[PDB]
Amino acid sequence: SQLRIVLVGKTGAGKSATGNSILGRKVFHSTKKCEKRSSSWKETELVVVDTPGIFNAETSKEIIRCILLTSPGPHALLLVVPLGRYTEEEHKATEKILKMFGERARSFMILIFTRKDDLPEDIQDLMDIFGDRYCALNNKATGAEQEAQRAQLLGLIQRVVRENKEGCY
Amino acid sequence: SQLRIVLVGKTGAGKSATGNSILGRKVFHSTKKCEKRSSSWKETELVVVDTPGIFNAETSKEIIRCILLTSPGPHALLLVVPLGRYTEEEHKATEKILKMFGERARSFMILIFTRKDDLPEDIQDLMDIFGDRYCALNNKATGAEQEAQRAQLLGLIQRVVRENKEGCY
Numbered sequence: 001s002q003l004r005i006v007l008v009g010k011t012g013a014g015k016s017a018t019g020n021s022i023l024g025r026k027v028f029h030s031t032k033k034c035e036k037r038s039s040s041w042k043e044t045e046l047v048v049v050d051t052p053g054i055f056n057a058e059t060s061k062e063i064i065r066c067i068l069l070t071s072p073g074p075h076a077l078l079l080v081v082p083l084g085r086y087t088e089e090e091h092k093a094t095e096k097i098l099k100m101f102g103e104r105a106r107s108f109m110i111l112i113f114t115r116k117d118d119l120p121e122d123i124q125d126l127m128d129i130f131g132d133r134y135c136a137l138n139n140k141a142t143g144a145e146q147e148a149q150r151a152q153l154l155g156l157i158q159r160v161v162r163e164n165k166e167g168c169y
Numbered sequence: 170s171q172l173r174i175v176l177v178g179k180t181g182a183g184k185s186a187t188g189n190s191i192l193g194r195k196v197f198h199s200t201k202k203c204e205k206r207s208s209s210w211k212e213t214e215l216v217v218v219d220t221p222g223i224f225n226a227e228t229s230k231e232i233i234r235c236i237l238l239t240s241p242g243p244h245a246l247l248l249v250v251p252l253g254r255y256t257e258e259e260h261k262a263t264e265k266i267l268k269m270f271g272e273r274a275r276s277f278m279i280l281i282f283t284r285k286d287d288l289p290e291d292i293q294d295l296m297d298i299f300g301d302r303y304c305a306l307n308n309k310a311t312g313a314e315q316e317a318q319r320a321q322l323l324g325l326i327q328r329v330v331r332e333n334k335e336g337c338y
C-alpha cells in the first residue's frame with residue numbers, strides 16, 4: 001500500500017536531502033515549488049512531497065497545489081530541523097508551522113533532525129512535544145550507514161502511522 | 170473511530186441540508202465560512218465539514234482554513250447536486266471541482282443528489298463517473314423515512330471508505 005509523507009521546515013533545514021534519504025535516491029535538489037516523487041520499498045509505495053520556502057497570494061496558490069498532491073491527505077508530516085544551526089529565524093518557522101497545524105496534527109507529525117554528523121531551550125521545547133516521535137539523520141551517510149538509517153527512519157514513520165488513532169477509519 | 174466528511178457543491182445544491190441529514194440534527198444553516206460539526210453514530214464519531222461558495226485572495230485563505238479543519242485529510246468528499254435544478258451554472262461548478270481534485274480524488278468522492286422529493290446529458294456524464302458511488306436524498310424527510318435514508322447514506326460512505334485502496338496505509 002501507499003505511504004504519503006510531506007516535508008516541512010525552513011529553507012536550509014535539509015528537507016530535500018531528507019527526502020532523498022527516504023526515497024533512497026538523489027531526486028530532490030538539495031526547491032522553488034512543491035515536488036512529489038515516489039519509490040518502491042518492500043511492498044510499500046513511498047510517496048514523498050518536498051516543500052519550498054512556504055514557512056502571500058502566490059504562496060497560497062502554491063500551498064493549495066501542494067495539498068492537492070497528497071490527496072486525500074498525508075499519513076505523516078515531517079518537521080525537519082538542522083542540528084547546530086537552530087538559532088533565531090529557524091525557531092520562528094517552527095512556531096508558525098505548529099500554530100498553523102495546531103494540536104490535532106500532532107498525532108501525525110514527526111520531528112526529523114538533520115546534520116547528525118556535525119555532532120538548549122529551543123531544542124528542549126521541541127522535544128517536549130516530539131519526545132516519542134523523532135529521528136536524527138546524517139543525510140551524507142553512504143553504504144551500510146545510509147541503509148541502516150533509512151530502515152530506522154521508515155520504521156518510525158510506519159510506527160507513528162499505525163499508532164495514529166485519528167488516522168484511518 | 171472518526172469519520173471525516175467534506176461537502177462540496179454550488180451554493181443552493183443542498184450542502185448544509187445534507188450535512189444536517191448526515192449528523193441527524195439541524196446544526197448547519199440551510200454559509201459564509203466553513204463550519205465543522207460532529208455527531209456520535211453507533212461507535213463512530215461523524216465529523217462533517219460544510220463549505221461556503223468556494224466553487225480570490227480571501228477565498229484562498231478560507232480554502233486553506235477549510236482544509237486544516239479535517240487534518241490530515243477527509244475520508245470522503247461529497248459532491249452535492251440538486252436534482253431538477255442542474256442546468257448551466259450548476260455544471261460549471263462541477264467541472265471545476267473535478268478538474269481541481271483530478272483523477273486521484275475519484276476514489277474518495279461520492280455523488281449526493283438532493284431534492285429527491287421533487288421527483289439529461291449533464292446528469293449522465295456525472296453518472297459515468299460516480300455510477301457505483303451515489304445517493305439521492307430528500308433532506309426534508311422526517312421520521313422513519315429520514316432515519317432509513319440516513320442509514321443508507323452512512324452505509325454508502327463507509328463502503329466507499331473501506332474500499333478506498335489508496336485511503337489508509
Ligand SMILES: Nc1nc2c(ncn2[C@@H]2O[C@H](COP(=O)(O)OP(=O)(O)O)[C@@H](O)[C@H]2O)c(=O)[nH]1
Nearest residue numbers: 011012013014015016017030114115137138139
Ligand atoms: N552535513 C550534513 N549536511 C546536510 C544534511 N542534510 C542536509 N545537508 C545540507 O544542508 C544544505 C541544505 O540542504 P537542503 O536539502 O537543500 O535543505 P532544504 O532547503 O530544507 O531543502 C545542503 O548543503 C545539504 O547538502 C546532513 O544530515 N548533514
Ligand SMILES: Nc1nc2c(ncn2[C@@H]2O[C@H](COP(=O)(O)OP(=O)(O)O)[C@@H](O)[C@H]2O)c(=O)[nH]1
Nearest residue numbers: 180181182183184185186199283284306307308
Ligand atoms: N425540497 C427539498 N429541498 C431541499 C433539499 N435539500 C436542500 N433543500 C433546500 O434547498 C435550498 C438550499 O439548501 P442549502 O442546504 O442551504 O444549500 P447549500 O447552499 O448547498 O448549503 C434550501 O431551501 C433547502 O431547504 C431536498 O432534498 N429537498
Ligand SMILES: [Mg+2]
Nearest residue numbers: 015016029031
Ligand atoms: Mg529543498
Ligand SMILES: [Mg+2]
Nearest residue numbers: 184185198200
Ligand atoms: Mg450552505
